[PDB]
Amino acid sequence: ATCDLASFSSQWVTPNDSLCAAHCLVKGYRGGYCKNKICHCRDKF
């Protein structure tokens, strides 16, 4: 149950809410350990 997924609309019908995408995408990340709800990406693409 790692929060290393939910990369926006990659494999989810995500509308805009980052969760583990949008925020990271700004820098260029797509996966990381989650805290509370938002994943703090620790891997850049």
UniProtKB/Swiss-Prot annotation:
UniProt subcellular location: Secreted
Induction info: By bacterial infection.
Similarity remark: Belongs to the invertebrate defensin family. Type 1 subfamily.
Biological function: Responsible for the anti Gram-positive activity of immune hemolymph.
Transmembrane segments: none
Cystine pairings recorded for this chain: C3-C34
Protein name: Defensin
Taxonomic path: Eukaryota, Metazoa, Ecdysozoa, Arthropoda, Hexapoda
Recorded superkingdom: Eukaryota
Residues of the full protein shown: 63 to 102 of 102
